[PDB]
Design a protein around this ligand. Structure first.
Ligand SMILES: *Cc1c(COP(=O)(O)O)cnc(C)c1O
Ligand SMILES: [Ca+2]
Ligand code: NA
Length: 431
């Protein structure tokens, strides 16, 4: 049973609380789209772990490559090159929009955003970084200063030169031009403001193709291109942080591929490790050379470690081979409609947005009022757990509670249905 008294005794005894509440269970096993507690009760994982396990839990291909390398090649001196490292880097150059030629292998997104930011600063001589008001780029310094989603209050000043502009949020438009939401004009407006505050040292703009931690906010048509022109106009580098959106989760190998806008630096992590700490950045050949000329340095314990590189290269192979990018769209459209149906039955569902297998559902007190649902969201996530379907809801201000639904890219048609069902029941007994 989950109750194991001596387990929770030790938990409250020696566990540091990093914000949030611990599920009242004990996960002892995880497979495909399920995790099991002490009693063996199966739980449908509609969060792919922490937006990671895109290949599902303990995917045999990953289990295979891991053992296969943990015993042959594991950790090396940062100065020694292996085959998993050079091939992973090569693969990344090959599957990323033309222009992105060289990669750096790290362990985390925060780490990856750090790397890209420092490189942009170095090749520009500038140090000012601009991002979105609801972005989440890690819990780490240079990557945490550009994170206005959370973690900047009560821990001293932010990082010198950090600016945030609003993110284009079509569901709750707050910038109007001619009785319409002109999110592009809203961009100029935001930038003009930034220019007056800037000391002329803008080095780059960092953005998620889909702001995950900020309530699953997708960047509208033509925005990305506009953002790019804005940066080019100011000698800025555009950095796309695809830690949760990269690797086919949104229906494209890379979400930036859909807008057709290639970033100066792309960063990956969550979905590249598939539950394993692997990250990376890819930049153009020219940028890499210039940064090299300025003595660009970024050492980490695991930079260029064979094992993580091997698992990452194997994750890519599984995604391509089993065409999981397509899988994301099919299972996504299926999940999206099932959601629109539920939205057709319950009024508390104000919006269904997102893309591929990265969807969000905002709960409102009334669809016409778009008035956030007080705790209603939490109530349903609670009912969803009892029903055996693990959910995740983010609560941002001026916005209603938002469910971030992200099943594995290996989720079956039936598992999608099962989830949809559980969710519907969750809402029924939640109201
Ligand atoms: C989750 C996330 C990160 C942080 O990854 P960590 O391993 O926790 O450092 C960075 N960027 C984005 C867009 C993320 O979603
Ligand atoms: Ca190393
Ligand atoms: Na490329």
């Amino acid at each position: 049973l989950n109750d194991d008294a001596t387990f929770w005794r030790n938990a409250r005894h020696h566990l540091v609380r990093y914000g949030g509440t611990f599920e009242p269970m004990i996960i002892e096993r995880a497979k495909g789209s399920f995790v099991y507690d002490a009693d063996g009760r199966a739980i449908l994982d509609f969060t792919s772990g922490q937006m990671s396990a895109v290949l599902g839990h303990c995917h045999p291909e990953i289990v295979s490559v891991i053992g296969e390398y943990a015993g042959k090649l594991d950790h090396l001196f940062s100065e020694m090159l292996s085959r998993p490292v050079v091939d992973l880097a090569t693969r990344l150059a090959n599957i990323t929009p033309p222009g992105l030629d060289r990669a750096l292998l790290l362990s985390t997104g925060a780490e990856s955003n750090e790397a890209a930011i420092r490189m942009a600063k170095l090749v520009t001589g500038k140090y000012e970084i601009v991002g979105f008001a609801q972005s989440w780029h890690g819990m780490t310094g240079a990557a945490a200063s550009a994170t206005y989603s959370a973690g900047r209050k009560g821990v001293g000043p932010a990082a010198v030169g950090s600016f945030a502009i609003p993110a284009p949020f079509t569901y709750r438009p707050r910038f109007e031009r001619n009785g319409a939401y002109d999110y592009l004009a809203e961009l100029d407006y935001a930038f003009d403001l930034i220019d007056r505050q800037s000391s002329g040292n803008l080095a780059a703009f960092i953005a998620e193709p889909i702001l995950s931690s900020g309530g699953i906010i997708e960047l509208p048509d033509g925005y990305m291109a506009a953002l790019k022109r804005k940066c080019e106009a100011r000698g800025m580098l555009l950095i796309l942080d695809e830690a949760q959106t990269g690797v086919g989760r949104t229906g494209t190998m890379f979400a930036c591929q859909r807008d057709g806008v290639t970033p100066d630096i792309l960063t990956l992590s969550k979905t590249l490790g598939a539950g394993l700490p692997l990250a990376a950045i890819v930049t153009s050949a020219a940028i890499e050379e210039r940064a090299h000329e300025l003595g660009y340095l970024f050492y980490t314990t695991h930079v260029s470690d064979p094992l993580p590189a091997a698992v990452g290269l194997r994750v890519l192979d599984v995604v391509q081979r089993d065409g999981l990018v397509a899988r994301a769209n099919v299972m996504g459209d299926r999940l999206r409609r099932g959601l629109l149906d539920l939205m057709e039955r319950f009024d508390c569902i104000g919006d269904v947005r997102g893309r591929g297998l990265l969807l969000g559902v905002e709960i409102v007190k009334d669809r016409r009022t778009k008035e956030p649902a007080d705790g209603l969201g939490a109530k349903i996530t609670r009912e969803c757990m009892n029903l055996g379907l693990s959910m995740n809801i983010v609560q941002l201000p001026g916005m209603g509670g938002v469910f971030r639904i992200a099943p594995p890219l290996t989720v079956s048609e039936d598992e999608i249905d099962l989830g949809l069902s559980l969710l519907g029941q969750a809402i029924e007994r939640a109201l």
